[PDB]
Amino acid sequence: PLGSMPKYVEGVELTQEGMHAIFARMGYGDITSGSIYNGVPTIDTGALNRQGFMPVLTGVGPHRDSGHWIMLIKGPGNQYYLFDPLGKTSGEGYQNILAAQLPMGSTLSVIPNGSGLNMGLCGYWVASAGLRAHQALNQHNPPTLLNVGQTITNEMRNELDHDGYRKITGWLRAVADEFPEGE
Amino acid sequence: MQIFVKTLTGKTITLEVEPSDTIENVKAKIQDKEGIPPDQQRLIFAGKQLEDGRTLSDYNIQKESTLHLVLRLRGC
């Protein structure tokens, strides 16, 4: 019988230290991240505006050790955006609880990307498409929200081929920040 | 008598604690103030992770000294 129970790479999860570490390696310094803990968000909006973005660990809690990374993005003016690699509906799940933490007069909109293109691969999409969405939404003449969501969806789907999976799996495996897969 | 506990999401948390007790006691104080159970907490004072039985002046942690709290959470 095919023995050796197999450690699959879709179960590599990023720690808080790992997320900070990924942003540091990319060059954003010692950033402050956010979270939603037992249903109450901690998001430092000063640091958000200073950084231009903030990763937010949702779905964690007293008993929930694993959860869901998303990206909070600050746009031009008082517009903030929520990027969820799982798609528009999932992010709309957090729209409200995150909106109540932003400055008075703010609006928080979810990037309308499609679900089903994530494939259980964590962190890479928030730490890649989120930053690219930030830059897209903050240029002089930004495309509409629909257009950014469309391009983000197409990019995740096209990067879905073998080569892309190999590149992602190399990155995920290179994450010596032991959130086990059973390890 | 007052020590600060700062976190990766930006927060400072004042904790009143006559420096003479134990690290599990600081963990209990943080659990009360923010609801995070003690077993999801790693406490680091001045590049040193803190052992439970070890006491607060074992680690020379004085008043106004600041401890960093990292949570044993992770997400997909």
Numbering used by the authors:
A (entry chain B): -3 to 179
B (entry chain C): 1 to 76
Please share excerpts from the published article on this structure.
Last but not least are erasers, or deubiquitin­ases (DUBs), that remove Ub from ubiquitinated proteins or trim and disassemble polyubiquitin chains, regulating the signal. Here, we explored disulfide-bridge formation as a strategy for producing a stable DUB–Ub complex amenable to crystallization. To this end, the Gly76-to-Cys mutant of Ub (UbG76C) was tested for its ability to form a disulfide bond with the catalytic cysteine of a group of DUBs. Using this approach, two disulfide-linked ubiquitin-bound complexes were crystallized, one involving the Legionella pneumophila effector SdeA DUB and the other involving the Orientia effector OtDUB.
While the SdeA DUB, an effector protein from the arsenal of Legionella pneumophila, reacted with the Ub cysteine in the expected manner showing Ub binding at the S1 site, the effector DUB from Orientia tsutsugamushi preferentially reacted with a noncatalytic cysteine. A difference electron-density (F o − F c) map calculated after the MR search showed residual electron density extending from the DUB catalytic cysteine, which we interpreted to correspond to the disulfide bond linking the cysteine residue of UbG76C. The free carboxylate at Cys76 points towards the catalytic histidine, much like the same group of Ub in the product-bound complex. The Cα atom of Cys76 of the UbG76C mutant closely overlaps with the same atom of Gly76 in the Ub product-bound structure, with the free carboxylates pointing down in the same direction towards the catalytic histidine, as alluded to previously. The thiol group of UbG76C points up towards the empty space in the active-site cavity, which appears to pull the DUB catalytic cysteine away from its preferred position as observed in the Ub-VME-bound structure. The alanine side chain of the SdeA DUB Cys118Ala mutant (the Ub product-bound complex was crystallized with the SdeA DUB catalytic cysteine mutated to alanine) also points in the same direction as the cysteine in the Ub-VME-bound structure. The movement of the catalytic cysteine by ∼4.6 Å (Cβ–Cβ distance) to engage with the cysteine of Ub in a disulfide bond induces a local conformational rearrangement, which seems to be necessary, partly due to having a substituent on the Cα atom of residue 76 and partly due to the aforementioned relocation of the DUB catalytic cysteine. The active-site cysteine in the disulfide-linked structure adopts an unproductive orientation which lies beyond an interacting distance from the catalytic histidine (Sγ–Nδ distance of 7.7 Å).
